[PDB]
Amino acid sequence: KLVKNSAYYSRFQTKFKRRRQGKTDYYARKRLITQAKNKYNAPKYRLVVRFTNRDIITQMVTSEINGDKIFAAAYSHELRAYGINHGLTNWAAAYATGLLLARRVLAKLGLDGEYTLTEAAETEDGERRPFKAILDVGLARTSTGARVFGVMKGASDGGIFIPHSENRFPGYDIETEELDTEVLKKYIYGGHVAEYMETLADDDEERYKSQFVKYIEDDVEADSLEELYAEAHKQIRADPFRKYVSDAPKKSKEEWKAESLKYKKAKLSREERKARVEAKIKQLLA
């Protein structure tokens, strides 16, 4: 029998568009945005962490009725302004991107005429409150050593209050319930990549060249990674809004409009569709 019939097509119910695209877990999203311990009618912020093949995307997001809003954003390809040109997806680049987003959020808030009702009703016995956000890992796996917790650690070190536990950081031991902060520091400053470089240079030279060809071409020794990442952290904390330009071709917005409309070809109109239908009917008759 044939199961994909007219009745099946009529009775079919599609999922959400982003669920069909496999991008959003709405079951987690509903509990992330519509559930709160208290009912104080307060805004809620989430640190959204996403990964591509060649970039890390960190955003600070509020949820509104017509769509989400981005309070601030930071990308791992912006680390080239602070000196990190290679390994833009490793765990330390995740730490640096989280730190950069934290510094940008604090600088935008001014915590590094229009004024708020908090300032209007502030009392004498009041202190500055930290910026609070909750982590959004999406569909990623929350295992020990994952880079979502590196973005979270970098943002928390930058100064965003993110509620978390330390049992998912690298170097944590589940047997003794203790975290090896030596391993954590090594991962923060990229010592795992440096140790891999040294091990490959000891054992497999051609695989070392193939894997770290750009490091050798730019003359980035494994022993300089800790100093480079520390200087990147200092530069990020000094100037969080440093302007960076890429090697991609640069045109204006309307120039890119014209360039993309030159390659977009338009939809057929009713007259053209009717002419094609008449031509098909004539071809079928002939």
Binding site: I33, T34, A42, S63, E64, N66, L117, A120
Partner: protein
């Protein structure tokens, strides 16, 4: 209720001294206009957290027979209803239906203006966050009728719709959105529903200067058919239960500020 999750569901659906936050179901008739669908979408966007939504066509006329409405209320545990419908005589109708014990407590009709309606997307402003409770302002002389009428019932429906979750405390940053309903005593009067985001400025004193900016939707209504409650059912619905944390006052017995029970002699 053999299953523990089913037992939890029935205990959630059980009557309580302090009732749960109120759930609204948005549903359509057999024939419903696109403007009415947009209006229900805007109301659902206002009330996402405590609403459910149907997506089929229902052959329901609430002013003829509401047995299907009572069945839907009993099945989905929803007790506010927004019913969309369209007709030649009434082109854009929003039927506000309120339950009590899974039966119809009362009903009201709103007639949407097709010309002056503007959706939330029609305004290029910052929108309300999901789950935020806005404040309410009711203006005009139509809500001060000595006899309960359509405008009093509409005020009750709109207050109950924008009630949200009650709380004893609120953050001062949760005072950024207001919903204003304007209606005048009078051929039929016009009930206007507007939503404004609030911008606050300095004014040189302690209290700040409040400025508003339109957030949407833009809605104009004419009140139509009304189904009034039974007096006994209304009395049973307006009975107020007392919390166990609300103590019963005894004669010559008090509690001091150190928590000691203190008796009075004369």
């Amino acid at each position: 209720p053999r299953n523990a999750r089913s037992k939890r569901a029935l205990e959630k659906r059980a009557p309580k001294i302090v009732e749960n936050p109120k759930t609204c179901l948005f549903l359509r008739g057999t024939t419903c206009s696109q403007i009415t669908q947009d209006a229900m979408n805007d109301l659902y966007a206002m009330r996402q957290v405590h609403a459910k939504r149907f997506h089929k066509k229902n052959a329901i006329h609430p002013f003829e027979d509401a047995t299907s409405l009572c069945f839907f209320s009993e099945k989905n545990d929803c007790s506010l209803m927004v019913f969309g419908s369209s007709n030649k005589k009434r082109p854009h109708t929003l039927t506000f239906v309120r339950m009590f014990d899974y039966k119809v407590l009362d009903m009201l009709e709103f007639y949407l203006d097709p010309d002056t309606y503007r959706s939330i997307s029609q305004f290029k402003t910052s929108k309300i966050p999901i789950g935020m409770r806005p404040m309410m302002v009711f203006a005009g002389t139509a809500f001060e009728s000595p006899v309960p009428n359509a405008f009093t019932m509409a005020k009750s429906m709109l207050i109950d719709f924008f009630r949200g979750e009650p709380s004893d405390k609120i953050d001062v940053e949760g005072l950024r959105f207001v919903v204003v309903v304007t209606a005048d005593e009078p051929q039929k009067p016009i009930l206007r529903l507007r939503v404004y985001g609030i911008r606050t400025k300095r004014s040189g004193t302690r209290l700040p200067r409040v400025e508003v900016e339109e957030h949407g939707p833009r809605m104009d209504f004419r009140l139509g058919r009304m189904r009034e409650p039974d007096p006994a059912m209304l009395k049973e619905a307006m009975k107020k239960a007392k919390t166990p944390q609300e103590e019963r006052t005894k004669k010559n017995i008090s509690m001091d500020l150190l928590g000691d029970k203190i008796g009075r002699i004369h």
